Write a protein that holds these residues in place. Structure first.
Motif, mmCIF file in Angstrom:
data_model
loop_
_atom_site.group_PDB
_atom_site.id
_atom_site.type_symbol
_atom_site.label_atom_id
_atom_site.label_comp_id
_atom_site.label_asym_id
_atom_site.label_seq_id
_atom_site.Cartn_x
_atom_site.Cartn_y
_atom_site.Cartn_z
ATOM 1 N N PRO A 393 2.227 16.809 -17.340
ATOM 2 C CA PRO A 393 2.652 17.816 -18.312
ATOM 3 C C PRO A 393 4.154 18.126 -18.334
ATOM 4 O O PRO A 393 4.719 18.389 -17.338
ATOM 5 C CB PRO A 393 1.866 19.053 -17.881
ATOM 6 C CG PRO A 393 1.723 18.872 -16.418
ATOM 7 C CD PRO A 393 1.605 17.409 -16.156
ATOM 8 N N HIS A 394 4.742 18.093 -19.492
ATOM 9 C CA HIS A 394 6.151 18.336 -19.639
ATOM 10 C C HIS A 394 6.457 19.811 -19.861
ATOM 11 O O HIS A 394 5.994 20.370 -20.798
ATOM 12 C CB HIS A 394 6.653 17.548 -20.843
ATOM 13 C CG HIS A 394 6.365 16.079 -20.789
ATOM 14 N ND1 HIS A 394 7.026 15.195 -19.982
ATOM 15 C CD2 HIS A 394 5.451 15.351 -21.461
ATOM 16 C CE1 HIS A 394 6.546 13.988 -20.176
ATOM 17 N NE2 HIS A 394 5.576 14.065 -21.055
ATOM 18 N N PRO A 395 7.287 20.404 -19.017
ATOM 19 C CA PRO A 395 7.643 21.807 -19.170
ATOM 20 C C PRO A 395 8.850 21.949 -20.073
ATOM 21 O O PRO A 395 9.927 21.685 -19.689
ATOM 22 C CB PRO A 395 8.007 22.205 -17.765
ATOM 23 C CG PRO A 395 8.526 20.970 -17.173
ATOM 24 C CD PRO A 395 7.701 19.875 -17.719
ATOM 25 N N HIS A 449 14.358 21.116 -24.598
ATOM 26 C CA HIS A 449 14.037 19.898 -23.937
ATOM 27 C C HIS A 449 13.061 20.040 -22.796
ATOM 28 O O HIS A 449 12.832 21.113 -22.342
ATOM 29 C CB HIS A 449 15.334 19.350 -23.303
ATOM 30 C CG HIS A 449 15.954 20.225 -22.242
ATOM 31 N ND1 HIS A 449 15.677 20.095 -20.898
ATOM 32 C CD2 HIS A 449 16.919 21.156 -22.318
ATOM 33 C CE1 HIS A 449 16.398 20.953 -20.211
ATOM 34 N NE2 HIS A 449 17.143 21.618 -21.049
ATOM 35 N N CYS A 450 12.562 18.904 -22.330
ATOM 36 C CA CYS A 450 11.726 18.874 -21.157
ATOM 37 C C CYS A 450 12.632 19.157 -19.947
ATOM 38 O O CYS A 450 13.623 18.582 -19.803
ATOM 39 C CB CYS A 450 11.086 17.515 -20.962
ATOM 40 S SG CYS A 450 10.018 17.496 -19.437
ATOM 41 N N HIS A 451 12.203 20.049 -19.079
ATOM 42 C CA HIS A 451 12.959 20.397 -17.906
ATOM 43 C C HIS A 451 12.716 19.498 -16.700
ATOM 44 O O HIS A 451 13.212 19.740 -15.680
ATOM 45 C CB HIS A 451 12.853 21.874 -17.513
ATOM 46 C CG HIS A 451 14.141 22.478 -17.041
ATOM 47 N ND1 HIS A 451 14.841 22.049 -15.946
ATOM 48 C CD2 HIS A 451 14.820 23.521 -17.538
ATOM 49 C CE1 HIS A 451 15.905 22.795 -15.799
ATOM 50 N NE2 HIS A 451 15.923 23.694 -16.750
ATOM 51 N N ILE A 452 12.000 18.400 -16.861
ATOM 52 C CA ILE A 452 11.922 17.353 -15.842
ATOM 53 C C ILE A 452 13.236 16.636 -16.111
ATOM 54 O O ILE A 452 13.430 16.069 -17.106
ATOM 55 C CB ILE A 452 10.693 16.444 -16.000
ATOM 56 C CG1 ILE A 452 9.466 17.287 -15.722
ATOM 57 C CG2 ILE A 452 10.753 15.267 -15.028
ATOM 58 C CD1 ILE A 452 8.120 16.635 -15.998
ATOM 59 N N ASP A 453 14.190 16.753 -15.218
ATOM 60 C CA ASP A 453 15.521 16.248 -15.467
ATOM 61 C C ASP A 453 15.604 14.752 -15.731
ATOM 62 O O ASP A 453 16.438 14.303 -16.453
ATOM 63 C CB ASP A 453 16.423 16.681 -14.298
ATOM 64 C CG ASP A 453 17.829 17.044 -14.728
ATOM 65 O OD1 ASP A 453 17.996 17.514 -15.836
ATOM 66 O OD2 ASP A 453 18.732 16.894 -13.918
ATOM 67 N N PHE A 454 14.719 14.034 -15.095
ATOM 68 C CA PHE A 454 14.680 12.596 -15.281
ATOM 69 C C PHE A 454 14.215 12.244 -16.687
ATOM 70 O O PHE A 454 14.572 11.233 -17.191
ATOM 71 C CB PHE A 454 13.815 11.938 -14.222
ATOM 72 C CG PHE A 454 14.118 12.377 -12.851
ATOM 73 C CD1 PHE A 454 15.287 12.045 -12.235
ATOM 74 C CD2 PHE A 454 13.208 13.107 -12.165
ATOM 75 C CE1 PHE A 454 15.543 12.468 -10.958
ATOM 76 C CE2 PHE A 454 13.454 13.530 -10.904
ATOM 77 C CZ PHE A 454 14.637 13.225 -10.301
ATOM 78 N N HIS A 455 13.452 13.114 -17.303
ATOM 79 C CA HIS A 455 12.999 12.881 -18.638
ATOM 80 C C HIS A 455 14.066 13.248 -19.616
ATOM 81 O O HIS A 455 14.255 12.574 -20.553
ATOM 82 C CB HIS A 455 11.738 13.626 -18.928
ATOM 83 C CG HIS A 455 10.580 13.189 -18.114
ATOM 84 N ND1 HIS A 455 9.381 13.836 -18.176
ATOM 85 C CD2 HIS A 455 10.410 12.172 -17.251
ATOM 86 C CE1 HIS A 455 8.531 13.270 -17.351
ATOM 87 N NE2 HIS A 455 9.123 12.243 -16.792
ATOM 88 N N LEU A 456 14.779 14.332 -19.350
ATOM 89 C CA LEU A 456 15.882 14.716 -20.182
ATOM 90 C C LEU A 456 16.918 13.571 -20.172
ATOM 91 O O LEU A 456 17.488 13.269 -21.154
ATOM 92 C CB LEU A 456 16.531 16.027 -19.669
ATOM 93 C CG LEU A 456 17.878 16.394 -20.238
ATOM 94 C CD1 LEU A 456 17.790 16.754 -21.687
ATOM 95 C CD2 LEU A 456 18.411 17.591 -19.467
HETATM 96 CU CU CU Z 1 8.983 15.583 -19.288
#
Ligand code: CU
Ligand code: CU
Ligand code: CU
Ligand code: CU
Length: 496
Positions: A393-395, A449-456
């Motif tokens: 899940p993307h926060p 944006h998504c707060h998973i930094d790797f996804h950002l």
């Molecule tokens: Cu994400």
């Protein structure tokens, strides 16, 4: 704690939070980054002095003050290439902003690439002398702040594109599978007292399922929004979220395990990994031997409500707003997409583009990633989960605002009457249709944006350009901000 006026000197150095030594980012010569505090109504004057020399972790920097509205100070928000150019090494930059209408638990972090993962991240607390929940606790101080963080033995740009954490740090300490005799964090309480613990996720990726053996937690704040008190026996905290909870230290004098289970990596507590210690005054200084009982009363987001039961903006029906947007996620080419576009940082910061004359979303770069928003309007945004966006899940996080979560993950209901309000929300898993609402009362370009930094880093973001025609007049910029771009653009690529 330091603040609201302070120097924050950024440098590189060796750290060992889990017993393994590695180079990282220091703030005022320490790791983890220091707590900053202030009081409601304060003006913050944070002078960021960048003395970093390590190119692998980036010598440049930019700091976001997570959760602050930044009304009139969009230039101080932090996202690189959106709200500013980065600060260059050997230089300093003053972030000067006011917080007139907020109080609660926040945090700061680098907002340049994946740099916060390398160590530039810490908690912030803005106290309220008139807190509506002050009667629920006796102690609320520096020692009641609890941070959760993911830690890696290889630096963000050295390891995999989406790495797996080697340890969970609680207040900057923890064990790894490789370390097992590393020191653990200890949180001390006195029997009979009530504490306001402020839990901050400084995570780059994992979410944590948090609990304390033998104790229940009365949740009173989510992402700097005051809630109706809600007692739970465990809670799931996603990247960048914050919760305040009251703990009544009414159990027997002893040592109890504090547990933070990640959704990836080592998913257990063997040997004391993913744990900390709750130590009652009087207990011997040893590890706990308590057991975890099944969580029968976990926190459920849809059951939380604001303290005043504030309604969602708009009319109580789907699409009952001035502008409805739907964000369709995807992944292609190794990059995430939203409505077909992948975010890539522009050469000229979005704010500067606007100040320089761009008047519409089609005039703004990067193309296809910027959305114009009307002023003084009710907005609804839906973020349906899909397997087409791996790593869910993307926060998701919206800058410059708090929003109502009219539909939460794992729930099929819509609540317009008294939904929780917050700033970071899990979008859940396939089948979910997390939906949020907010009003446009803050001119400027705001990151979503998504707060998973790797996804950002892989492009999972858009920019909300709010009330473009009023941006310049509402956000006057300091000369030091105007100077950032030429300074950065003159650097050799080796010194970025
Ligand atoms: Cu994400
Ligand atoms: Cu953040
Ligand atoms: Cu933010
Ligand atoms: Cu952001």
């Amino acid at each position: 704690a330091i603040g609201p006026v302070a120097d924050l000197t950024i440098s590189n150095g060796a750290v060992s939070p889990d017993g393994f030594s590695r180079q990282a980012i220091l703030v005022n010569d320490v790791f983890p980054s220091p707590l900053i505090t202030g009081n409601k109504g304060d003006r913050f004057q944070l002078n960021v002095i960048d003395n970093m020399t390590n190119h692998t972790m980036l010598k440049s920097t930019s700091i976001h003050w997570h959760g602050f509205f930044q009304h009139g100070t969009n230039w101080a928000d932090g996202p690189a290439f959106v709200n500013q150019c980065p600060i260059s090494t050997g230089h300093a930059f003053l972030y000067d902003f006011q917080v007139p209408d907020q109080a609660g638990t926040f945090w700061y972090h680098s907002h340049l690439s994946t740099q916060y993962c390398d160590g530039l991240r810490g908690p912030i607390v803005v106290y309220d002398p008139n807190d509506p929940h002050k009667s629920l606790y006796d102690v609320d101080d520096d020692s009641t702040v609890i941070t959760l963080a993911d830690w890696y033995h290889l630096a963000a740009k050295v390891g995999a594109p989406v790495p797996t954490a080697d340890a969970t740090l609680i207040n900057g300490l923890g064990r790894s599978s490789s370390t097992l005799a590393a020191d653990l964090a200890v949180i001390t309480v006195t029997k009979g007292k009530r504490y306001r613990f402020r839990l901050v996720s400084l995570s780059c990726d994992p979410n944590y399922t948090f609990s304390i053996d033998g104790h229940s937690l009365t949740v009173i704040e989510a992402d700097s929004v005051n809630l109706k008190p809600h007692t739970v026996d465990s809670l799931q905290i996603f990247a960048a979220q914050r919760y305040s909870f009251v703990l009544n230290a009414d159990q027997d004098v002893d040592n109890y395990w504090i547990r933070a289970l990640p959704n990836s990596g080592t998913q257990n507590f063997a040997g004391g990994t993913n744990s900390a210690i709750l130590r009652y005054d009087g207990a011997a200084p040893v590890e706990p031997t308590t057991s975890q009982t099944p969580s029968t009363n976990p926190l459920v987001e849809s059951a939380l409500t604001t303290l005043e039961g504030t309604a969602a903006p708009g009319s109580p029906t789907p699409g009952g707003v001035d502008l409805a947007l739907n964000m369709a996620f995807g992944f292609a080419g190794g990059n995430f997409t939203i409505n077909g576009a992948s975010f890539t940082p522009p050469t000229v910061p979005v704010l500067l583009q606007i100040l320089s004359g761009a008047q519409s979303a089609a005039d703004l770069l990067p193309a296809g990633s910027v959305y114009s928003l009307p002023a003084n309007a009710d907005i609804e945004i839906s973020l349906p989960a899909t397997a087409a966006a791996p790593g869910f899940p993307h926060p998701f996080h919206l800058h410059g605002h708090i929003f109502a979560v009219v539909r939460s993950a794992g729930s099929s209901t819509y609540n317009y009457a008294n939904p929780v309000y917050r700033d970071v929300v899990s979008t859940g898993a396939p089948g979910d249709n997390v939906t949020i609402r907010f009003r446009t009362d803050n001119p400027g370009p705001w990151f979503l944006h998504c707060h998973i930094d790797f996804h950002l880093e892989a492009g999972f973001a858009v920019v909300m350009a709010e009330d473009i025609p009023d941006v310049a007049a509402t956000n006057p910029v300091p000369q030091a901000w105007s100077d950032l771009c030429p300074t950065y653009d003159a650097l050799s690529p080796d010194d970025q």
